[model samples]
Target: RKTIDTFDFTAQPSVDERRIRELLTLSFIDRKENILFLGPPGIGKTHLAISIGMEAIARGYKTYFITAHDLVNQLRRADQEGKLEKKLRVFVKPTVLIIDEMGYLKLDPNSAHYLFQVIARRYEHAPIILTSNKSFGEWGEIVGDSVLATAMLDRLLHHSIIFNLKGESYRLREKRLQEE
Candidate 1:
């Protein structure tokens, strides 16, 4: 129901129209770079995440969308059933994986390990479009482990684009990565 064009002033007040517009060209997907959107509530985090996904889908990315809660929940179920690898294939195989609302801490703590497995699995090839309301520091708490958070961050930030959205979506975040 949303696309890049649908984002209005009510959406991201401080967004850079140039780079944001450049993203619509789908260059990131072509080069297999990850997209990370970290922001507070109601700043159109979900909307922008979905818009990028929709663009990817239109361009034949075989995109998959899932909430972090369900993802970890199913991962646990699969791990318990000894089908962890197979269950994980569903996530890893997708060319574009968009996992939204990833700050939830209510999952079983072990789920972090499972999430780590998926993150590591996808690290080399697949690009993930992740949206989180929490900061890198807080993820240690959200996932219930500093080690996992740091490890995940290590993988997540490697060849990744980080977007930090703040009050009213102004200057959402400074672009951190340049061509490398």
Candidate 2:
């Protein structure tokens, strides 16, 4: 896992490096405030999430990390097998839950509802570090249910540290500098 020191704060000056450093203290976790990182692809969304997640693990916090796509599939399968309740427990039980890549897929009603269940179950007690490429306005577009998106974000943004990161794509930068 990459450390926070590995993040190029200078590359994304729009990000509040000071605030990022401050959150490393992890007091927000205890305060039950969720962290949301929104930006285009490869702009350090997952990187920052991983950094905080790794830090949480170092401090002995029980954590769970899952991509939105994987999470949706698991939830769908578990429901088919009549195990959704048990699967939801796994996600909610974690002290810190990091669900990455929210805008990567267009969700159906079932997927959207499944995602909401996890977020709602963790609401107000367990904090989540979520990374998405979509803006708050686009969440409904991606989820295919404006009302469901509102419900999910209501809990997420209720007590949240929202980071709207903006910058060039890291992979594209690396690609331009590459020989291959």
Candidate 3:
């Protein structure tokens, strides 16, 4: 139940403050957990993902934050260096990996394969926090191949908790006055 005070969920008007604080307690790790934060642009998806990572870091858990695209790029580079396997070992070594911007861009077949390796490697052993604007069904298109996308999701969602934030976009609220 120990969480760092760096993240103030109290200021999160879109979410129920108490429920968010409760989630910080991590009462659901027993089932090989994962969390998905889905919402349109600027709805604090990245914020929550990093907030969890910051908490995990504060709690002495090895944590890493990498965007979906960047992670794949690193893996591809590692391959040319003949250390993709080793790099992946380190990438997935963390207790938790906060994957920000999952739906930001669709992966090419190559990058999708690269990412699939990482997901496949971490399957059921480590946990991840994903923040994205897309739903699970759209993942195949985003990942560039139906089969690989399905494979990745199968492992990632085996024991996952979904947080579907599908209401008003935060950007809309912030720009309300400017929008005629």
Candidate 4:
């Protein structure tokens, strides 16, 4: 509720307004389609992703929110503790998984594989809303392997909608006003 309530629809015009409104209809979720929010920080990409996740919750769908770092770290810990299966289910079981702030840090090969496993498992079975500052071509750099990155992207983008938000960050806009 908080996420949806606070989202200002007028803030960013870089993304097609009509498309976002269509997404709110929740048809994409029903179709098991993924959403990729590609933009820099403070551009409201995360806000939009969370709003969609919140909408899924309102429609009685299970939703999970996890940062990319936290997800990979959890997978690493789960494998160490011999609870990898249990942990992965937590990610796969959710009807909508919101992976936020991807590419914030470089991921090792093991972490990249761990992330790939999740995406592979959920392919066509559930929807994922991912927010990342990196472009598709740059994902190999973040994941530490081009081949694996391609495989993951192949599955994810098969039935996904990508929104490239471009504009001044909301925080920057506010800061400029404060300085005036």
- Who wins the TM-score comparison? 2
Residue 30 deviation, candidate 2, in Å?
A: 1.4
- Report model 1's TM-score to 2 decimal places: 0.88
lDDT (10s digit) by residue, model 1, range 1-180: 578786775446655667666777878876767888888776777888898889888988888899989899998999899998899999999888998899954556877788888789888688889999898888888888888789998998887887887665323332222322
Better of 1 and 3 by lDDT: 1
Clashes per prediction?
2, 0, 0, 0
Candidate 4 wrongly placed segments (more than 4 Å): 1-5
Candidate 1 clash pair list = 14-171, 164-172
1 or 4, greater by lDDT: 4
C-alpha lDDT of residue 77 in model 1 = 93
What is candidate 4's local distance difference test score? 0.89
Writing each residue's lDDT as its tens digit, candidate 3 over 1-180 gives: 223354344434556656566657765444558877887877667777777777677778888889988988888889989988898987789888878898779877777788777777777777888888898889988988888788889988888877776455556766885886
Clash pairs of candidate 4? none
- For candidate 2, what is the TM-score? 0.95
**Cα shift from native, residue 101, model 2 (Å):** 0.3
* Lowest summed lDDT window (length 10), candidate 2: 103-112
Expressed as tens digits, the lDDT of each residue in 55-131 for candidate 2 is 88999999899988888889999999999999999999989999999887887766778999998988999999999
Model 1 weakest lDDT span, ten residues long: 171-180
**Would you list the C-alpha lDDT of every candidate in the order shown?**
0.81, 0.89, 0.76, 0.89
C-alpha root-mean-square deviation, candidate 1: 7.8
- Compute the lDDT of residue 55 as modeled in candidate 2: 86
User: Alpha-carbon error at 125 in model 4, in Å?
Assistant: 0.2
Q: Please give the range of 10 consecutive residues that has the lowest summed lDDT in model 4.
A: 1-10
